[PDB]
């Protein structure tokens, strides 16, 4: 799994010694977070389940 | 085979852990990229 | 600059270390952590 965004994190102080972080900017390749699953591995799983059900 | 389905995943920052309404924890965003690998062990199904 | 289309660039006011002085900064957020009432 991944969040493929090169991201810049900046810091500020909101009050009497209270730091805070925020997403400043991203460097420029706007993507979407995702996860890969091996396909043939997953079908091999579900055949075991219906075998018992 | 030699294939990989891929899921759309979203990002949130304001969570409510264990549905305890009133408590709101903020997620500090972190720098660099994100990679984490995990096994699959347990599943929940509902008849 | 132009294109089609999960981020919001947000005008934002805030306090400072001192009690009276304000702070006009900007940041980014996602979709599901902010709500319309622009």
């Amino acid at each position: 799994c991944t969040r493929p965004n090169n991201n810049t994190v900046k810091s500020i102080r909101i009050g009497p010694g209270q730091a805070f972080y925020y997403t400043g900017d991203i460097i420029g390749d706007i993507r979407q977070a995702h996860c890969n699953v091996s396909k043939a591995t997953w079908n091999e799983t579900l055949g075991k389940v219906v075998k018992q059900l | 085979s030699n294939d990989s389905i891929t899921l759309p995943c979203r990002i949130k920052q304001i969570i409510n852990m264990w549905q305890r309404i009133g408590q709101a924890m903020y997620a500090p965003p972190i720098q660099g990229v994100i990679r984490c690998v995990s096994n699959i062990t347990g599943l929940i199904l509902t008849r | 600059n132009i294109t089609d289309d999960e981020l919001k660039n947000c005008s934002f006011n805030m306090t400072t270390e001192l009690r009276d002085k304000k702070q006009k900064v900007y940041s980014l957020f996602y979709r599901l952590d902010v709500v319309q009432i622009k």
Partner: antibody
Amino acid sequence: VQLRESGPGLVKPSETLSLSCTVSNDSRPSDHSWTWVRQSPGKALEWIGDIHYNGATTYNPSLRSRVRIELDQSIPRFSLKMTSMTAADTGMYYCARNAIRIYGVVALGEWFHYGMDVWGQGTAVTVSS
Amino acid sequence: ELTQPPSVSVSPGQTARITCSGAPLTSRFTYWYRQKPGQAPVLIISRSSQRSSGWSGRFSASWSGTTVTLTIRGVQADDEADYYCQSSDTSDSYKMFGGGTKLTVL
């Protein structure tokens, strides 16, 4: 990158159309888009259709009932099947490469069209008798 | 569809601007081409990644409403051709062209 069209030159009315466009010197031929666009004399351009190597095709919906675009990938040459030729379709026809670059998962639509960089020879499509 | 001026007249040396208008240009991206008469079209403005202004070399383009202005800096007498804006629909189903715009150079 080279490309060359292929045409008969003179086509009778009410017959069909067989065109193709051969591509060479392409290090990644497999990840572009391939399209036909025609042009009438003294007129604007006229998009026809497109093909990608998965097999997915779209078309101009007004012209869709008479056209078909197919593909060989061993020889990087994609074809063109227009039926029912009329004299109003006399013009200058083009094959073109529409490039796509990738910023992530192809199956999630994390790509964008670069733009149509490479344009064909042009062919004097003459529908006459 | 799209909307263009039919012809634009300018002397050499000045800055000619062509406004491609149209209903799909609320959202989608605009192409540009050049075609000499008797020869092939030429892509003249392509794009990089989305937050990168596409590409800025010799030409540029701005956006305001449904109008897209085609800025030509440093007009000389050799760029005489016919010009075309291109986009697709917001539904992303089919691809249309501009009407066509002649460059008139004094």
